[PDB]
Design a protein around this ligand. Structure first.
Ligand code: HEM
Ligand code: HEM
Ligand code: HEM
Ligand SMILES: [Ca+2]
Ligand SMILES: [Ca+2]
Ligand SMILES: [Ca+2]
Ligand SMILES: [Ca+2]
Ligand SMILES: [Ca+2]
Ligand SMILES: [Ca+2]
Ligand SMILES: [Ca+2]
Ligand SMILES: [Ca+2]
Lengths: 678, 452, 678
């Protein structure tokens, strides 16, 4: 590890300059005690120059994100399908670093914005660094990389005033979507719960593009990468996500960090779909088109190995901010395809690192270094950290005995382009007509959602599109939505007071696919790390005792428990003033606290009606909620919460309450609380 | 627009490269209709290279902010207290640009966080650009610029995990405040409604530091700048600010934008407290200490002129993101004081623009340019736009007839340091004992608030 | 070995990317064998991106230079005059790196231009890096750092056409000198032999400024740094320097490299003049004025230790090009003075490294690292290598238990400003009248040169000034020269078509000072590394035999021998076609080769007259020359060289030839061959 060698320990010692001279740094050098500061104060200038130059350009996209270290372990020797060394043996472990992100917001923007999300994984393999630079949605908005600035300019804030930070809440974004129909598949995903995942740990990762697996014999197959969450899939509800974006802008980065610090590091099965070269157009669409998925019914997933994140960074800036991913970081055994979105990406990520790093030696940053020797004739450049011994860095040479040697298919384990690949035809700036069906798969995705999930998507569209000022853009939007689903266009049109255009059934169908729905993916497989808010009072010794009782039990089941009361003390984590339902996955009121709720209700220590509002919000947003200890009635009545409601608990027995409530936490959302269009 | 000369119109025309060759930009050049992309596709590369390099480093502090253009109008001829040209005639008008901001959060952090706020004003005067780089709170946390990184590291997110955004909600910030008691006065202000103003239009601007006004005869007085809102002061309530941060992270920038578009451009009376040099220690504290206000009961405000913001930018990046303020942008008639916070600032803002701009010619960006001619011997550097005719850029010269000439108090309307300033004593890294009362003024402030 | 941890070996292995993936780099990936190159060719792009970004800005001055590693060893414990740790014990060793340079030319300009030269030394001390950033001339052109760009613009090429390279050969430089008379002292130095040293090893190093030595008790003394060459002082003659600029632009860098490779690493005694603070104005000038020396007659040198350079770099770019010196790299025991030239330097060198390195972490380059631990709260910035474990990098803190601790005079061996220093008075942009005598010291320096040396300086002035177009500028130059010396003005004026102004005796005097003359500094103390060219012929096996004999005699004494003949073979190093007298410190003809020695001598293998012209040029340029074997007349008469001349040798006996000739090498130059004005 190059990271270990560069760890700097400041737990002891006297302050020094960056050249080891002991110094101070608290008072400027001045000509007399009330005098002007001196130019000769080097202590001052070196410290302030450093401060003045701390910042580097944020990423052009995916600026907001967070990372962690961990380990990938192969489940088998996969030699039969790829020459990739990291996959060549059962149990082979390779270090990883992952960064997760949103796409459109700047650094500092909230984690819980509605957006596409990044899931970028570096495997520090024994034959070079291999990056899979993925998203949590398996399809992308556009079909050619040259369009990327168009898409991004359209979704980022309007450039006269840099308003708004909400990617989908403005005219220009919808102008682009409605004029560029390829966008429809990703737009439907982004309008689903996949736009507001519950956490990084509760989403999947996709390579998006078709890639190749290449064997040592030169043969190739076509693959899609799928990183399948072992935590289960889960989303926020929209109103919850909007509150969260104010109450805790760092919600996802904090959820990740805390899960790793508690020993609950997240896991994914790294999987592929594998198909033959001859099936490039067999599935009703072109595998070069990054706006299409291969339905799992046509190509099942094969599990290749386990990805686990189990260590946090030491210095966020040095590790997370400076990690520089590239789809060009490929290894023997993997190759590209002619997907025009992937093709252009290869150029963009090598170039943009010059912008961020300010010089060409970015791969020498510890987080970017490989874990094998580097042998090449790259030299000089700003920020050169190596002292190269070889004074004849050219090929061919005799003066260094012909080293470094060329690597290729038959030497040195070289990378090699899949040798079956060809190209033929004119040199064209033309779109393949095989790419032209922009609507069937959006409809496939929509069909595969549950009824209340369909409602949530329609409601997201109603919310966002109602913020578009231009009537002409809104009509254009309905034109495209209607090519996917007339019912979607009708329902969305109703909220914005326009008429939907008449049904156009060209692309309509009733087909469905497995594995895309959040609401239909079933209870979570684990409730470890999920958050329980226990609403108590310092008024009643019995209330605090009840909360402590609940705590001990819930904690041994891996839940993160917060006891809330008017003021802090022994056993109480959070005041009502700072508490919010967005902080919890379930809320329990201890019945000793009934007085705070069954009330209007007033104190200089928190806002009027806060305790009840926490419970009310939690219910409205679908969470398991309950009252533990004796007389539920009054709290549930004060909240207008029905005691017979699914995911509403009322028990005197602490043990029965915990059992029932824990089943609620796995269910995670009670969707019968949300109204549906008739 | 005052930057009309630099505008580029794209309401008509065919797409071109940056060198005027008509091109397309929607499909990559490929070897066959389902083929790989070609390296010879210059259309693709020049567009993507530009996109790849769009971003520049955010400001080290005050990263989150918004700006507008306007006009300053002097109420009087202020010659009898300052030689400043922009203040030398009743009704004299000078263009301005102002940027408002928070302090701690990054780009895209919400407007309605609890924080200190910036209020930075550029006057494009007929004798040079003059910047007053102020905040909405009249006192600062610390008493020496060398401590700035300490303060800022402590309020910014913890550096292992970059949590939390939200300057005051974590241990390190309160560790620093409690170890560095100078911070109490600004801390009390930030914990008041001044930490969550209703808009940029409903807050005041303060230079914080004592500065000097200098007359053409060389006499000086000590001043504090106060920009007093004509919209009134108003705050959010905290609960509301928290919900707004989520519902509308752009709330202050939109409020300002909208007010200008509707013809309600915000206004401030630009004022000063003026006191004699003999009064530097007369008010029971030291006027060099930036943690203290001069109570208005001791020195009333004089209104100098009107600041009105009435024109939004054309391109946010080019104007607002790229504007580069400096307290060293000073003009004849103003001078510095030995406030050790101010003193170090003068170094920081000139250096940090190298970081943002990536080269030394940042004064050439349209928003940074002055509105009068430039005559000097600065040359070259990355990004040099100017084509200088003078092929002898050194002084003293005879081969360019001794031009440019030196400007000073007696010739050429030069800047000059206030000639009554002196220094005396040991060269010390010592804090004046006159700085040591960290608590009385925070109590003055608290006492001055209503009960609620 | 001092930077061994950063070394990269490429003597074995297969080529890899920068992230360790084995690759090739000799053929682009193409769509067919005669097809266009593919964007997906990451091998191509990463290699070419690196190439495209290899260059960094050259230094703003001193762009042309060369460097080496070495060791400093202290002669004593100097705690009686300084707290500095590297000087605190007899025998104490500290690693060093030195870079030597010219000043005006760009990084590809010739070594042997007439110029001021740099001598910058880094001591990697056990209390931090300490740099002495000196020159080979003890005084500077200007008295205030603010004037630096005026000076440098005036000497660098005219900015319309970037002509001429060659600092003194144009109007603007002499315009500046004549308008800014402070320049006279350094000008007279640069017009002497000190402007064209024979090698970096044959020049001294000076700090120029008065600095302070500060004891641990707080008391201070004023010092000047003098690095006195143990190789002796030596110059080129001007015509020779001009020829060398064309025949070997790398002459000084090669001389240094070679001396080190041969185990003849150059040495200096590091010395100071030490005077009391009360003697700031006692010597008839102000010690804050960098245009003045303290004559050695008023303040003798104290030898502090030995500097020896003995290891060449491994990678020039990484070590020599990237070394970033600063006078701000100061250590406890040393302080600044209020010299206004020094004061502003402190700002310049910290700022300019942002330009060169392109980011703030330049102290992390291996050559710039200290050799002790770094403990501070500087963070982030582009190119940040360090992974800092202290997540509370602010002072004051409790969450990192108050570390790093402040260092100062009384704790932690902090740097401290000399506590006796004060300032008093108005804040002014005024020059001290104590700086106003710009002419007395130039006259002192001129008076201390020998007659022939004064002639050489006049002749350099005549050469350069005659290239100034402007008759006004020429007139103004003679006004200033005449204030130093009427006779200089007269003699210069005679070459350039003008009358000198009448004598103005205000600053005239006859005082002299020791240690500044080159011609007067006596024979060299060592002749090891000096170059002897033996001119032979392949047309007589006897001539080669003589050459071989002489070679062994000369090599025994550490001279570097080149045997020249018409064509190469074993024992012959160089052809006449490539050889030139600039290549040698002495020239010997073996008498077996006498037939070659005619201006008549014609051949397709070398220019007509070449063998003889080497001998004639050597003679004209002052060098020891002779004929070995017993028959000298034919060669000597062809050369018009008299047999009884001083530094002309003729002997049959090889031993007796060599004994005589080695005395001539030590004398080095026979100045009786140069005409004097009468
Ligand atoms: C399938 C389509 C894509 C996926 C899945 C994807 C994914 C991502 C991810 C996850 C990141 C963030 C990596 C990190 O965490 O540091 C990112 C950054 C970026 N992407 Fe993409 N991307 C796609 C398409 C594009 C295209 C078409 C372009 C350009 C033509 C592009 C240009 C960029 C740039 C310039 C960055 C910033 C990289 C950096 O500064 O390190 N991407 N992408
Ligand atoms: C009286 C105390 C201070 C006030 C009122 C103040 C005000 C501000 C304001 C308003 C801005 C943003 C300007 C804009 O909108 O672009 C800012 C930026 C900045 N300030 Fe200060 N500041 C203070 C003290 C300090 C100190 C002590 C330092 C450093 C020693 C410092 C360094 C900076 C830097 C580096 C920036 C970013 C500038 C840029 O990138 O253009 N400030 N300051
Ligand atoms: C006593 C007067 C001076 C001496 C002896 C001197 C010496 C030198 C030396 C030897 C170097 C080259 C160091 C190396 O080899 O890398 C150099 C570089 C330089 N000097 Fe000076 N210098 C003097 C005055 C000035 C002044 C007054 C300034 C500016 C105000 C200045 C600015 C620079 C700059 C900008 C560089 C390039 C540094 C780099 O890129 O690392 N120097 N100086
Ligand atoms: Ca818009
Ligand atoms: Ca959902
Ligand atoms: Ca290949
Ligand atoms: Ca903290
Ligand atoms: Ca308020
Ligand atoms: Ca010239
Ligand atoms: Ca000489
Ligand atoms: Ca740069």
């Amino acid at each position: 590890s190059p990271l270990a060698a560069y760890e700097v320990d400041d737990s002891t010692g006297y302050l020094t300059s960056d050249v080891g001279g002991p110094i101070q740094d608290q008072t400027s050098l001045k000509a007399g005690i009330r005098g002007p500061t001196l130019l000769e104060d080097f202590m001052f200038r070196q410290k302030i120059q450093h401060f003045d130059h701390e910042r580097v350009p944020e990423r052009a996209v995916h600026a907001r994100g967070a990372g962690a270290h961990g380990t990938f372990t192969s489940y088998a020797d996969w030699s039969n399908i790829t020459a990739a060394s990291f996959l060549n043996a059962t149990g082979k472990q390779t270090p990883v670093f992952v960064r997760f992100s949103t796409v459109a917001g700047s650094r500092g923007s909230a984690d819980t914005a509605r957006d596409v999300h990044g899931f970028a994984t570096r495997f520090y393999t024994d034959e070079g660094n291999f990056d899979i630079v993925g998203n949590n949605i398996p399809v992308f908005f556009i079909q050619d990389a040259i369009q990327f600035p168009d898409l991004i300019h359209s979704v980022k804030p309007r450039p006269d005033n840099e308003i708004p930070q909400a990617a989908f809440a403005h005219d220009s974004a919808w102008d682009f979507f409605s004029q560029q129909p390829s966008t429809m598949h990703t737009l439907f995903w982004a309008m689903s719960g996949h736009g507001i995942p519950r956490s990084y740990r509760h989403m999947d990762g996709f390579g998006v593009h078709t890639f190749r697996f290449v064997k040592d014999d030169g043969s190739s197959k076509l693959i899609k990468w799928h990183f399948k969450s072992r935590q289960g899939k889960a989303s926020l509800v929209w109103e919850e996500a909007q509150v969260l974006s104010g109450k805790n802008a760092d919600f996802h980065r904090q959820d990740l960090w805390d899960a790793i610090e508690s020993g609950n590091g997240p896991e994914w099965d790294v999987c592929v779909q594998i198909v033959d070269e001859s099936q490039a157009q067999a599935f009703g669409f072109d595998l070069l088109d990054p706006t299409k998925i291969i339905p799992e019914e046509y190509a099942p997933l094969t599990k290749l190995g386990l990805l686990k994140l189990d260590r946090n960074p030491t210095n966020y800036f040095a590790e997370t901010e400076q990690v520089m991913f590239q789809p060009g970081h490929i290894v023997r055994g993997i190759d590209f395809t002619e997907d025009p979105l992937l093709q252009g990406r290869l150029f963009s990520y090598l170039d943009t690192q010059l912008n961020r790093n300010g010089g060409p030696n970015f791969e020498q940053l510890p987080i970017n270094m490989p874990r094998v020797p580097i042998h090449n004739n790259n030299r000089d450049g700003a920020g050169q950290m190596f002292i190269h011994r070889n004074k004849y860095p050219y090929t061919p040479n005799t003066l260094n005995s012909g080293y470094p040697r060329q690597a290729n298919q038959n030497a040195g384990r070289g990378f090699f382009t899949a040798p079956g690949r060809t190209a033929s035809g004119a040199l064209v700036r033309e779109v393949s007509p095989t790419f032209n069906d922009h609507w069937s798969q959006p409809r496939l995705f929509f069909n595969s959602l549950t009824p209340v999930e369909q409602q949530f998507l329609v409601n997201a569209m109603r919310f966002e599109i109602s913020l578009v000022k231009s009537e002409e853009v809104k009509k254009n939007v309905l034109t495209q939505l209607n090519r996917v689903s007339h019912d979607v266009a009708v329902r969305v049109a109703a909220a914005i007071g326009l008429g939907a255009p008449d049904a156009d059934d060209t692309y309509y169908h009733n087909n469905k696919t497995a594995g895309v729905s959040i609401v239909g993916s079933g209870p979570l497989p684990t409730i470890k790390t999920l958050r329980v808010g226990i609403l108590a009072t310092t008024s009643e010794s019995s209330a605090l005792d009840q909360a402590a009782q609940l705590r001990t039990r819930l904690e041994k089941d891996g839940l993160v428990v917060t006891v809330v009361a008017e003021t802090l003390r022994e056993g109480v984590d959070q005041t009502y003033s700072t508490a919010d339902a967005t902080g919890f996955d379930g809320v329990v009121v201890v019945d000793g606290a009934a007085a705070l709720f069954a009330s209007t209700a007033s104190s200089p220590l928190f806002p009027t009606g806060r305790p009840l509002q926490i419970f009310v919000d939690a219910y409205r947003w679908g969470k398991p909620v309950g009252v533990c200890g004796g007389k539920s009635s009054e709290v549930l009545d004060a909240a207008d919460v029905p005691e017979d409601g699914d995911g509403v608990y009322s028990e005197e027995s602490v043990d029965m309450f915990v059992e029932e409530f824990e089943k609620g936490l796995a269910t995670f959302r009670f969707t019968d609380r949300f109204a549906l269009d008739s």
